[PDB]
Amino acid sequence: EGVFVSNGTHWFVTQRNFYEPQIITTDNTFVSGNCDVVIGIVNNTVYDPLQPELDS
Amino acid sequence: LQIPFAMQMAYRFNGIGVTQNVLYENQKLIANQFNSAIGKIQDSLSSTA
Numbered sequence: 001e002g003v004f005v006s007n008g009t010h011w012f013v014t015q016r017n018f019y020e021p022q023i024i025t026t027d028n029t030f031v032s033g034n035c036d037v038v039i040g041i042v043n044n045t046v047y048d049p050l051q052p053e054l055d056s
Numbered sequence: 057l058q059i060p061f062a063m064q065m066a067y068r069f070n071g072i073g074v075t076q077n078v079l080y081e082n083q084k085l086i087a088n089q090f091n092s093a094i095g096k097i098q099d100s101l102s103s104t105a
C-alpha cells in the first residue's frame with residue numbers, strides 16, 4: 001500500500017498521498033516471481049523483522 | 057504531480073481490484089492491447105461516418 005521512493009541513496013516505501021518514508025520490509029511489501037520480468041526493477045535490500053529476534 | 061505512466065497504470069489496476077504485479081508482469085501485452093485498441097478507433101472513424 002504505497003510507492004517505492006529514493007532520496008538519492010536510500011530506498012523507502014511511502015503512502016501515496018503524503019510523504020512519510022518507511023524502511024522497506026517483508027511486511028509493507030509482497031513477493032511475486034523473480035527479477036527477469038519487471039521493466040525497471042531495482043536492487044535494494046528488504047528487511048525481515050523476524051531475523052534479529054530469531055538471532056537472540 | 058508527475059508519476060511514470062507504467063506506475064500510473066499499476067494504480068489504475070489496484071483501483072479495479074487486480075493486484076499491481078499483474079500489470080508489471082504483463083506490461084508489454086497490456087501496452088500492445090492498448091495500442092491495438094486505439095488503432096481500431098482510427099479504422100472505425102475512417103469508415104463509419
Ligand SMILES: *[C@@H]1O[C@H](CO)[C@@H](O)[C@H](O)[C@H]1NC(C)=O
Nearest residue numbers: 038039040041042060061062
Ligand atoms: C528509464 O529509461 C532508461 C533509458 O532512458 C532505462 O535505462 C531505464 O531502465 C528506465 N527505467 C525505468 C524505471 O523504466
